[model samples]
Target: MRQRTIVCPLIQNDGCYLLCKMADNRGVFPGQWALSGGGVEPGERIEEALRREIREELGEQLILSDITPWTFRDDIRIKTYADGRQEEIYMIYLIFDCVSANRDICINDEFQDYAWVAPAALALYDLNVATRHTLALKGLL
Candidate 1:
């Protein structure tokens, strides 16, 4: 089974992007800074998954726009538990742009905190290799 994840660089007026510190245990990249989205659920289209995840994780409705017609494919090992149950994971990275709603964003159990980081500053955060590569391709690195 493949787990699809969508990651959007929430751009701010100041040209900074939002990054979240994930608190989930589903992947080896937990505790690192990442884009704000997650696994695609059953019976939902990819765009729907993106909208739902943004609302759930960020506490604001996002209108996905100027969506780039590009997809990223990568493979990694996801850590499942303390006993070392591992799964080889495949991820599809989707990129989109949106205007953020006017609301105070909330961090859920899946994430500990959030940051508005400049593109150059993104390198300071511990990011998964795939995410880093995607950002580089988009010239956001």
Candidate 2:
């Protein structure tokens, strides 16, 4: 099995959380709303990866406050190759609770749209399992 570490920042602004809608053409979790994040590169620090992902996704010089570990989870995903081979990926998630004062977001190609929503509104969107689980575990949903 392959292993990977994923990191995300659950950015809060004025009591609402930020969620991005993944592009429909995306291969993994396409068209699902999710927190802003990506996989951690080898030898890169967690905070460095987090900042890079945020800047890549949201085009803003964002300053995150109160960044702390919010939740952690391990997941197993089966990847099927074009050659009819299958492999299981062992993934771990590092979710952080952070605050941002700016609500303006210019999303990149990875996401089709973005939203700042209250906790109650989370259920209305078609969210990925990791995002949903994180919000629920934090008692925000």
Q: All candidates' lDDT scores?
A: 0.65, 0.85
Residue 87 lDDT, candidate 1, scale 0-100 = 66
Model 1 clashing residue pairs (backbone): none
Q: What is the lDDT of candidate 1?
A: 0.65
Regions of candidate 1 where Cα sits further than 4 Å from its true position? 1-13, 24-30, 61-70, 78-87, 101-103
| Superposition-based RMSD of candidate 2 using all C-alpha atoms, in angstroms | 1.8
- The superposed Cα distance between candidate 1 and the true structure at residue 9, in angstroms, equals 5.5
lDDT of 1 by residue, 60-140 (tens): 643433344355546554647778876666666666655443335677777888787777888878886766776777777
Per-residue lDDT for 108 in model 1?
72
| C-alpha root-mean-square deviation, each candidate | 3.6, 1.8
